[PDB]
Amino acid sequence: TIHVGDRCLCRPGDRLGSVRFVGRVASLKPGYWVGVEFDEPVGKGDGTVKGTRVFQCQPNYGGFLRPDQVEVGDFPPEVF
Template identity: 45%
Template sequence: VNISDSVRTWKKKILAEHGHEGDHKADHHADKELNEEAAKKIKVGDRCEVRVRGSTARRGVVSFNGETKFREGIWIGITYDEPVGKNDGSVAGERYAN
């Protein structure tokens, strides 16, 4: 896994180039645009590594990329290699991933 190609690294680079000034609402809008732009580069079937602070990194496959009924914005669903995770690909009875 090449960390220099991570979404987090990419977002930091863009924010450094364009600044991170303004009110909270403007910052939220800019962050939302960056997230949407990053999500366009992530494809269902891509291999990935997920790192959550305080947890061991986990690898898996992107199984969903898009909007949901349960919350605004673009969501990325991951099917982990190991049998871990919060759900089975569905939320509130709506299936998003297999």
């Protein structure tokens, strides 16, 4: 299970980020979605869907992914 605040690596390409949203979003496709804020500007979006905000996020840092694309783990930003 995926919770808001979780750290993650996301497909494709092991994109590092934080889970900002988990839930259904009708204006996308049916089923559950995970809103991710990436550390780097590798997101397809900015946390909105056709303009409507779902989670706070800046342009190029936001993605909505299916849960199968999200690996929750201990992935803190590298600092040392």
